[PDB]
Amino acid sequence: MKVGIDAGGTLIKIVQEQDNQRTFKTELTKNIDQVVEWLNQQQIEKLCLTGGNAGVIAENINIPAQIFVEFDAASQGLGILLKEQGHDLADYIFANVGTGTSLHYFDGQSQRRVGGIGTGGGMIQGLGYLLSQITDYKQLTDMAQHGDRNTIDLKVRHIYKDTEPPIPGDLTAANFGHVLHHLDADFTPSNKLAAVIGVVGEVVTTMAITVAREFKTENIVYIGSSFHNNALLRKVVEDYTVLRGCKPYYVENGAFSGAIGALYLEKHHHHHH
Amino acid sequence: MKVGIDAGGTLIKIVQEQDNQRTFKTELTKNIDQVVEWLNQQQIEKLCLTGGNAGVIAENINIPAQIFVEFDAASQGLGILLKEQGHDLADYIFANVGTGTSLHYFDGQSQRRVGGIGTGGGMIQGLGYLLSQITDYKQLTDMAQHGDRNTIDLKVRHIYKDTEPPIPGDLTAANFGHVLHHLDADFTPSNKLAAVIGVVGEVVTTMAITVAREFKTENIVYIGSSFHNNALLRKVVEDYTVLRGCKPYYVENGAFSGAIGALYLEKHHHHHH
Ligand SMILES: Nc1ncnc2c1ncn2[C@@H]1O[C@H](COP(=O)(O)OP(=O)(O)O)[C@@H](O)[C@H]1O
Numbered sequence: 001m002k003v004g005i006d007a008g009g010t011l012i013k014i015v016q017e018q019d020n021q022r023t024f025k026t027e028l029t030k031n032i033d034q035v036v037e038w039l040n041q042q043q044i045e046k047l048c049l050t051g052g053n054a055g056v057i058a059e060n061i062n063i064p065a066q067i068f069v070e071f072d073a074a075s076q077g078l079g080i081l082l083k084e085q086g087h088d089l090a091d092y093i094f095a096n097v098g099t100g101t102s103l104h105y106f107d108g109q110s111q112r113r114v115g116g117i118g119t120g121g122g123m124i125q126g127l128g129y130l131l132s133q134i135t136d137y138k139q140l141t142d143m144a145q146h147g148d149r150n151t152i153d154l155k156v157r158h159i160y161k162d163t164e165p166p167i168p169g170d171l172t173a174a175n176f177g178h179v180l181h182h183l184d185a186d187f188t189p190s191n192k193l194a195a196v197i198g199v200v201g202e203v204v205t206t207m208a209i210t211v212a213r214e215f216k217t218e219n220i221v222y223i224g225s226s227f228h229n230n231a232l233l234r235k236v237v238e239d240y241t242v243l244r245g246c247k248p249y250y251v252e253n254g255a256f257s258g259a260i261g262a263l264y265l266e267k268h269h270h271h272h273h
Numbered sequence: 274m275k276v277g278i279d280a281g282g283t284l285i286k287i288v289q290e291q292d293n294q295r296t297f298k299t300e301l302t303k304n305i306d307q308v309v310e311w312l313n314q315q316q317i318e319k320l321c322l323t324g325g326n327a328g329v330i331a332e333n334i335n336i337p338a339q340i341f342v343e344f345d346a347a348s349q350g351l352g353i354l355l356k357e358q359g360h361d362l363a364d365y366i367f368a369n370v371g372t373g374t375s376l377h378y379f380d381g382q383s384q385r386r387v388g389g390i391g392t393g394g395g396m397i398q399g400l401g402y403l404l405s406q407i408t409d410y411k412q413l414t415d416m417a418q419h420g421d422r423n424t425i426d427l428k429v430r431h432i433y434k435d436t437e438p439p440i441p442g443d444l445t446a447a448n449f450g451h452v453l454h455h456l457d458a459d460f461t462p463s464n465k466l467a468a469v470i471g472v473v474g475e476v477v478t479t480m481a482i483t484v485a486r487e488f489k490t491e492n493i494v495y496i497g498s499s500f501h502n503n504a505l506l507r508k509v510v511e512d513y514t515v516l517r518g519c520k521p522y523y524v525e526n527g528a529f530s531g532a533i534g535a536l537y538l539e540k541h542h543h544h545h546h
Pocket residue numbers: 007008009010011012051097098099100120121122123124125137223224225226227228255
């Protein structure tokens with residue numbers, strides 16, 4: 001039994017490897033003591049750790065651990081998953097939409113971080129809570145899926161009206177920019193939450209397409225737990241990526257890229273010269 | 274009396290020129306009929322118009338009008354204001370933070386639009402209203418200035434804790450990402466509004482610095498009415514621009530760039546070959 005753990009800001013992702021097969025597990029970072037409880041019931045010779053909370057797991061258990069930097073671990077695990085899933089890409093941007101969002105350019109050989117933004121899953125939860133009082137992640141995301149953004153967001157065509165606009169009229173001109181034009185609307189929790197997911201998706205995708213243009217790649221791979229149980233977010237991102245002439249990729253178990261990467265990096269750290 | 278009008282999504286900006294001197298006026302786009310009332314009391318031979326609502330003014334009054342595209346009008350008026358204010362820049366990004374945000378690269382000769390995002394003034398107002406029930410712009414912005422974002426936003430150092438992080442620990446990791454860690458906090462209107470201004474500023478600045486890097490300029494000029502009565506927004510943007518090694522510029526009357534640009538373009542449209 002080997003174990004890779006990516007202990008992030010909101011979720012701890014665990015990949016248990018037992019004889020040619022992955023078992024995937026998640027736990028809330030809030031419940032990190034329960035991950036330690038679990039580890040203490042296993043027969044594990046070594047922990048392969050990454051993520052901001054890796055140090056906390058390592059401090060709190062007597063199993064040898066090695067820590068890897070999340071950006072390299074994520075890149076490496078993602079490279080493995082892409083190849084397993086039949087994608088042999090020469091280069092790509094990857095956008096890791098976790099608690100927050102980190103953007104990387106992979107040139108075929110290694111990753112470099114090319115930007116980031118605090119619009120991600122943490123915003124969906126936190127701003128979602130302020131607008132709906134919902135704390136349960138499944139409830140929040142389920143509620144959002146069929147929300148109508150029309151009374152909340154302003155489009156370019158709302159500003160330009162009968163004049164042909166200088167950029168496409170369907171584009172969002174201002175997230176939440178229609179609220180003051182609809183002050184007698186019922187701003188339902190569903191509608192508000194859809195608009196939160198909308199702005200997060202639009203910001204992420206805009207940054208990803210911008211760095212794809214800068215680094216001359218048409219491929220953009222989207223990973224992170226923020227996509228889980230959020231088909232709306234996936235659609236916002238996929239649609240706008242395609243509109244801007246890039247190819248979006250989503251990866252089965254992509255949220256476990258870092259954990260897979262930690263196991264791989266540990267394995268290949270052992271060499272000599 | 275010559276008149277330039279930039280009739281935007283939220284504000285109509287008017288520049289009245291009378292014998293070597295500008296007079297600046299603003300009106301809400303909501304009140305566009307009151308701009309037409311005003312125009313009908315003046316002695317104006319021609320209107321120089323730009324912005325999404327230009328067509329509405331032109332349709333509703335019997336004074337000859339010529340319409341200019343806002344991106345060129347803004348660029349040209351901004352170039353005039355920069356030189357008047359002692360800035361002789363070889364190149365720059367300009368970020369027009371209006372109802373929404375439009376980003377341009379000026380290479381010394383002309384502008385091209387290099388991106389945009391729906392995070393801008395309209396979001397400040399609309400999301401601000403959803404979080405505070407305040408509709409008055411001065412009240413909203415004044416309330417926000419001294420808000421404390423600490424119980425609302427998550428920083429990198431909150432995730433990494435005792436481990437040295439791979440990027441600076443003071444950076445926002447997740448806008449609104451601390452809300453679920455402070456569910457018993459008093460989320461005051463001031464604090465919520467500061468966090469709205471924060472995310473808008475951070476997104477704008479992140480996009481501006483990214484395109485500054487792409488187009489190889491260190492100069493970033495920020496214009497738009499979204500900065501009016503919002504010293505907090507100005508500070509968020511200035512600080513993060515400087516952190517990322519770029520030089521921020523704010524322009525006196527920069528929000529009137531388009532209106533000034535329309536008057537100039539009209540003037541120089543008359544030539545022959
Ligand atoms: N079961 C869940 N509980 C809470 N958040 C979830 C869950 N599933 C998905 N998420 C979403 O995923 C985000 C975290 O993404 P992830 O890639 O795991 O980030 P991190 O590495 O920072 O923990 C959350 O902020 C939330 O939007």
